[PDB]
Design a binder for this molecule. Structure first.
Ligand SMILES: [Mg+2]
Ligand SMILES: [Mg+2]
Ligand SMILES: [Mg+2]
Ligand SMILES: [Mg+2]
Ligand SMILES: [Mg+2]
Ligand SMILES: [Mg+2]
Ligand SMILES: [Mg+2]
Ligand SMILES: [Mg+2]
Ligand SMILES: [Mg+2]
Ligand SMILES: [Mg+2]
Ligand SMILES: [Mg+2]
Ligand SMILES: [Mg+2]
Ligand SMILES: [Mg+2]
Ligand SMILES: [Mg+2]
Ligand SMILES: [Mg+2]
Ligand SMILES: [Mg+2]
Ligand SMILES: [Mg+2]
Ligand SMILES: [Mg+2]
Ligand SMILES: [Mg+2]
Ligand SMILES: [Mg+2]
Ligand SMILES: [Mg+2]
Ligand SMILES: [Mg+2]
Ligand SMILES: [Mg+2]
Ligand SMILES: [Mg+2]
Ligand SMILES: [Mg+2]
Ligand SMILES: [Mg+2]
Ligand SMILES: [Mg+2]
Ligand SMILES: [Mg+2]
Ligand SMILES: [Mg+2]
Ligand SMILES: [Mg+2]
Ligand SMILES: [Mg+2]
Ligand SMILES: [Mg+2]
Ligand SMILES: [Mg+2]
Ligand SMILES: [Mg+2]
Ligand SMILES: [Mg+2]
Ligand SMILES: [Mg+2]
Ligand SMILES: [Mg+2]
Ligand SMILES: [Mg+2]
Ligand SMILES: [Mg+2]
Ligand SMILES: [Mg+2]
Ligand SMILES: [Mg+2]
Lengths: 118, 150, 211, 59
RNA sequence: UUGUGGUAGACGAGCGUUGUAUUGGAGUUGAAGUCAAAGCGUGAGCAUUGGUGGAUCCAAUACAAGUGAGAAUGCCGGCA
RNA sequence: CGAUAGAAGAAGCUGUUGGAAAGCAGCGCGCAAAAGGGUGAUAGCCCCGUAUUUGAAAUUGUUUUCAUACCUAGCGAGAUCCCUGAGUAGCUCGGAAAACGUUAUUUUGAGUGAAUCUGCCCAGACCAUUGGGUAAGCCUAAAUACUAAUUAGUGACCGAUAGCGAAACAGUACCGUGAGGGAAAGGUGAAAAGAACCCAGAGAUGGGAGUGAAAUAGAUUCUGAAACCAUAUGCCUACAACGUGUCAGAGCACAUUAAUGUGUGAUGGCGUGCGUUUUGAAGUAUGAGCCGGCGAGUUAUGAUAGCAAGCGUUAGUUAACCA
């Protein structure tokens, strides 16, 4: 019983080739280089999901910090005032407010500024 | 069960076959379980049985047993044991009766020996070439008897 | 059970035959049945596959190139397994056994349960010598008999004790149906039947064989 | 498989599968051992668990 | 509720190829092969449609293996 | 009774898709024939065949019967006489055969050398008792070993890198003084009906025409994958430090296995391949130019252990062999 390989190697090879579509030259043509690039690309994608979670936080912090310095308050004290006033809002939504709703963002800063903590 | 649906009892037919050459996903790829570059990982094998890497093996270290009856064979005996003979159903135990009960082969001439201590209830009449003194005591403590063929 | 006779015309006899309880078993064994079918499927293998190993294939036992100083890799023969000439490393051999052993009592138990489940069921009618010779040796009459009995698509098996010739002359051009002696039927032939016609003296021989 | 001719003549088996053996250092040079040592080495023993597996397949 | 990094290694559960045995089914109103596409799966993998192709193939339960290729200055053929 | 040529050998039409029916459907028929092959697709009933019944002028094989050669025949008595295998059996010196690494038994290169049924040899040194057997002469069917070849057939064997090295004109082409070593290469179509004829060209050839169901089936002749080489719709690219990807992200161009769609990616953040072997490899260590095929845990006989089934306390189970 001589089992002969055909359509088994080609199908699993073409899957890797399909994944590595849009690469530079031989990186999409040859199966070997395509397989290496897909594995490396998967590693990159894994690492950059974690790094995206951190980098977008940093960007929101930067935007919020800037929005506060125009009014004379700093980020380091704004978050402290937020905690003492029990207000719980993401820096993402706060930055979205300062870019989309200047009046309501200014309302939040006014309350945290001076109103009695709790 | 039909021939289009036939099934074995669970955990009787199929067991995990360890395939040693088909990929790392099975945990038995590349090296195939031999280890790494040593004598046991080559095609030769696992040396010799009893080898100790040059140190004198255990058998070569210990003295040889002695055979007093050199070139001889121990005389085999057919032994009737008292603890189990009660379970067998027969009276007047001779060679012919054992042949009918097929305990002994008709094409055998081995001498019959009686052995045992366990008490028996019904009396039996043995025809034995040899019998122990206390086995005879047990047999004759009941209403049985024993004759010693010569 | 109620095992009833069948006549040549396809009508049923009005007198059913009682069955001794020794034939039917309250306890059924399926693993011995499975092993019996497997050993029947085995031993049907011719096993005439053969291949030429590295030494058996005609070729040059010399080294093609020198061991060193050539840009090519080390080679020892032109008929190595990884060569196109072809030396098969292990390959099938014509010395394989393919045979399996099953105990005599295990086979008896498998046959016992298979008879129990096949018997006392539909299409398990009783047959005699009259229609075994009323066939006249013409397979047209037997086709009519199967049509009347509505057993055309069934793989009916005739179980025969006296090897009637008229019945064997027919049912030989029929790839579907077949006839066997009691000492010739096995577990696999019994449960492939889907329908069977058993002779009364065959049935009497069955209780005797089971013991 | 053949039973090793040296494994036999040196290792006798028992009812429960233990492998009986003889003590060494009982061939010559007697004055270099104490009578306590000699009378302790006269008695027989059994192979240890470190050697039981190696002798089982050897016999 | 306690957990789930992992080489050598131990254990368990599965996928896929070819053929055989039982059942059923599809196919010149177009099977296998083969190419493409913006599908489905936890993974081996599995579908749908269209083009080419011209005659075999599929599903289930078991069984037997020349049964799984990325590397061996591996062999052969082709092409850079 | 066969072998080497042979004879006879049953049973179907209609309609539909189709180039073509044997497929499909309707209504039937034959069978000791439903093995197989061909026939424009997949035929029990179209053809050749198969089951079954038969037949040999000539050569040859086996068996049986009859006759005929050759060989082949029992039980006593008395005599107490003769014959029964010689450089032979033993023994010594060197070797060997037997499971034995030389030793009771068998054999022999050199030397020596017996006895004659109250005899000789043997029963693991050797002696005695007991018992067994007749060396130094010859022939012997059957069961046993194998298949280059002839006939029939089979395969959970291979299907052009496989199977014999050899599907073709293969031990050929070719290599070597020689012995010797030793390849690759199959498929048009049902039928050549193999493309008359016209146009360009010197011609091959190509484009039409024609045959054909199909000519993108055209002799380069089943299907036609990837690497590789060219053409083009769309997007981007000439201040730019790049394991070439990933996460975000404008603009551009389309519309799908309708899916928070697809193609490209100005720009921002991060980012030193895969196997091997090493304490440690991006490695200035190693292996791979790329693509495709092939390429490495098997079989036979036994042992142990795990799991499961059958049979069980005078249990359990057969091997060879026969059907
Ligand atoms: Mg392959
Ligand atoms: Mg591992
Ligand atoms: Mg291991
Ligand atoms: Mg090491
Ligand atoms: Mg290694
Ligand atoms: Mg090691
Ligand atoms: Mg040493
Ligand atoms: Mg070959
Ligand atoms: Mg883990
Ligand atoms: Mg299959
Ligand atoms: Mg297709
Ligand atoms: Mg392989
Ligand atoms: Mg004819
Ligand atoms: Mg005819
Ligand atoms: Mg046909
Ligand atoms: Mg002598
Ligand atoms: Mg020898
Ligand atoms: Mg005498
Ligand atoms: Mg003696
Ligand atoms: Mg004589
Ligand atoms: Mg070839
Ligand atoms: Mg080729
Ligand atoms: Mg020449
Ligand atoms: Mg043309
Ligand atoms: Mg070409
Ligand atoms: Mg072609
Ligand atoms: Mg620029
Ligand atoms: Mg500049
Ligand atoms: Mg820089
Ligand atoms: Mg950059
Ligand atoms: Mg970037
Ligand atoms: Mg970089
Ligand atoms: Mg690897
Ligand atoms: Mg090193
Ligand atoms: Mg180093
Ligand atoms: Mg470098
Ligand atoms: Mg170097
Ligand atoms: Mg190295
Ligand atoms: Mg290199
Ligand atoms: Mg390659
Ligand atoms: Mg076991």
């Amino acid at each position: 019983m001589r089992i002969k390989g055909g359509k088994q190697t080609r199908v699993r090879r073409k899957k890797w080739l399909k994944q590595a579509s849009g690469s530079f030259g031989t990186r999409h043509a040859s199966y070997k280089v395509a397989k290496q690039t897909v594995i490396q690309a998967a590693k990159y994608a894994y690492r950059d999901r974690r790094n995206k979670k951190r980098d977008f936080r940093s960007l929101w912090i930067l935007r919020l910090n800037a929005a506060l310095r125009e009014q004379g308050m700093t980020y380091s004290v704004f978050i402290n005032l937020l905690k003492k006033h029990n207000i719980e809002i993401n820096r993402k939504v706060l930055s979205e407010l300062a870019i989309k709703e200047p009046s309501k963002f200014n309302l939040i800063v006014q309350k945290v500024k001076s109103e009695q903590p709790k | 069960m039909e021939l289009n649906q036939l099934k074995s009892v669970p955990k009787a037919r199929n067991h995990k076959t360890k395939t040693l050459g088909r990929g790392h996903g099975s945990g038995l790829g590349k090296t195939s379980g031999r280890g790494q570059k040593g004598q046991k990982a080559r095609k030769s094998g696992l040396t010799r049985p009893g080898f100790e890497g040059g140190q004198t093996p255990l058998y070569r270290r210990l003295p040889k047993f002695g055979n007093a009856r050199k070139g001889f064979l121990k005389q085999e005996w057919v032994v009737l044991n008292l603890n189990k003979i009660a379970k067998l159903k027969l009276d007047k135990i001779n060679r012919a009766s054992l042949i009918e009960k097929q305990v002994i082969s008709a094409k055998s001439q081995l001498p019959i020996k009686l052995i045992g201590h366990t008490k028996l209830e019904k009396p039996l009449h043995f025809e034995v070439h040899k019998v122990s003194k206390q086995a005879l005591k047990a047999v004759e403590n009941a209403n049985g008897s024993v004759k010693l063929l010569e | 059970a109620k095992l009833k006779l069948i006549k040549i015309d396809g009508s049923f006899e009005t007198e059913p035959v009682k069955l001794s309880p020794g034939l039917i078993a309250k306890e059924l064994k399926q693993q011995p049945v499975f092993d019996a079918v497997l050993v029947e499927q085995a031993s049907w293998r011719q096993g005439t596959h053969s291949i030429l190993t590295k030494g058996e294939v005609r070729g040059g036992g010399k080294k093609p190139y020198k061991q060193k100083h050539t840009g090519k890799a080390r080679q020892g023969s032109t008929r190595n397994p990884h060569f196109v000439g072809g030396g098969i490393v292990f390959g099938p051999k014509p010395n394989r056994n393919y045979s399996l052993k099953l105990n005599k009592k295990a086979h008896t138990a498998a046959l016992h349960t298979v008879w129990s489940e096949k018997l006392a069921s539909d299409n398990t009618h009783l047959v005699d010598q009259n229609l075994f010779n009323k066939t006249e040796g013409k397979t047209k009459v037997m086709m009519q008999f199967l049509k009347s009995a509505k057993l055309l698509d069934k793989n009916v098996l005739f179980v025969v004790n006296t090897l009637n010739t008229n019945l064997e002359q027919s049912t030989s051009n029929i790839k579907n149906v077949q006839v066997k002696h009691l000492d010739k039927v096995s577990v696999r032939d019994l449960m492939l039947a889907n329908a069977l016609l058993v002779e009364k003296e065959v049935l009497k021989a069955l209780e005797g064989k089971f013991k | 498989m053949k039973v090793k001719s040296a494994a036999k003549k040196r290792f006798k088996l028992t009812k429960s599968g233990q492998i009986k053996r003889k003590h060494a250092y009982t061939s010559h040079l007697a004055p270099h051992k104490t009578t306590k040592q000699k009378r302790h080495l006269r008695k027989q023993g059994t192979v240890s668990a470190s050697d039981f597996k190696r002798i089982g397949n050897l016999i």
